[PDB]
Write a protein that binds this ligand. Structure first.
Ligand SMILES: Cc1c(Cl)cccc1OCc1cc(=O)n2nc(-c3ccccc3)nc2[nH]1
Length: 131
């Protein structure tokens, strides 16, 4: 995961409100979450990867081993079963809850870390650069 490790700042967002709607996030949480622009930190220690926020909305921190399911409480307070794998150089994060599923892909492209959040047919793209 070397090219992912670091501190990343949000530079652009498209369709994130629509993504959150499709996920089922309520109005007030969408408004506050949509404004929040924390930097996102990826660190690695051995086989354990950590993804952490620093948010004005809600701080989060997940630690995991690739391929191994874990419990995650998302920023919008869903309790999900998550699995994150590294597929062709892309981190692929699947969240399962209440019979539903969403996938978040994170990939390096040029000097960007591009996050693609997909819920059914809705995709949001959020672009980060090194802080
Ligand atoms: C905030 C939120 C709500 Cl309320 C609801 C559903 C999904 C959400 O976030 C999903 C989501 C949005 C986003 O901007 N990022 N940025 C990263 C990222 C960027 C660089 C390095 C590591 C991780 N991961 C995500 N995941």
């Amino acid at each position: 995961c070397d090219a992912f490790v670091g501190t990343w700042k949000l530079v652009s967002s498209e369709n994130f409100d629509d993504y959150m709607k499709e996920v089922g996030v309520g109005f007030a949480t969408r408004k506050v979450a949509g404004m929040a622009k924390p930097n996102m930190i990826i660190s690695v220690n051995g086989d354990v990867i950590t993804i952490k926020s620093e948010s004005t909305f809600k701080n989060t921190e997940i630690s995991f081993i690739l391929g191994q399911e874990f419990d995650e409480v998302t920023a919008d307070d869903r309790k999900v079963k998550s699995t994150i794998t590294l597929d062709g150089g892309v981190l692929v994060h699947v969240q399962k809850w209440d019979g539903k599923s969403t996938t978040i892909k994170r990939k390096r492209e040029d000097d960007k870390l591009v996050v693609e959040c997909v819920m059914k047919g809705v995709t949001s793209t959020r672009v980060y650069e090194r802080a």
